[PDB]
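G., the chain you wanted modeled:
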Amino acid sequence: STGSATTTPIDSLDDAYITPVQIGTPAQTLNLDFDTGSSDLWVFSSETTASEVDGQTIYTPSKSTTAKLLSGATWSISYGDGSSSSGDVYTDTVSVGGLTVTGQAVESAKKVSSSFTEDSTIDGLLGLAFSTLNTVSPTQQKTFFDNAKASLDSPVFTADLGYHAPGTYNFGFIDTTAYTGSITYTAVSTKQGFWEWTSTGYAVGSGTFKSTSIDGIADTGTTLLYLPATVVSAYWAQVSGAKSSSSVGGYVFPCSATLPSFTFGVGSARIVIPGDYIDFGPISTGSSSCFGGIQSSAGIGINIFGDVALKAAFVVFNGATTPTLGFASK
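Predicted structure as tokens:
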């Protein structure tokens, strides 16, 4: 089997992407944030504290003839950015782009933190990291991909995120029309539960390539590109007036700037992030200070190849017995 679904930016900055997901019988369609950095499929629901729902579409398990309470199971997750959610668990039928999993754990939120409430466009998350990170207790549950894998034509999914435009998540096949050149594959460590890999270096604009190993995660659920402070300083030094602002929480730059590109290495191959992808707009409405899309990972504990990086590539998440990651230009 295969599946193919369009993923759409939630706003004009590509702060996140949402993908429609069918849950239950009859189908209830929710728009979920596909997150290769976590492993829980959780949704706003009829059980979510009423004051914490503000415009999201909810899953109502009592209206699904295929929903079953997973008795005794609870979940609770806290993301790196400080947001969180928790609740109980149902199993139900879940379909993405025509690919169907029966008996998928659907984690129903009883509580969500303020940032979730405040974002009316995201109805929940669909985790695509390794199932070892799944938070369901006392019986850990499998991700949608893990459950689908054996049925898929090939045990892979691909992320093709758009810049200020829709893109595609495919399951079970590689669309050879969706990228240019060849796909370069690189090793993955699953030791921390992430799609963790090592970039071979970087360049800033038309500058020379610096060969250096950068360990990090391929994380569709993180907006920005977070790299070591040395790398980030080298990038922003090429933008007149750019500076790190403790009050704003990262590098800012004059909105009048033209940003240089940033290149990262994948083996001997190179992925070029155009400068415009690195612009996240005014820090507050009407400001002429703009927020940068490349930020320091110092104090995160890991480097993160988030959407800014991934949207410059066609990315293969290869879930073979020994997982790997593939990157192509597009």
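Residues 229-236 form the longest helix (8 residues).

Shout if anything looks off.
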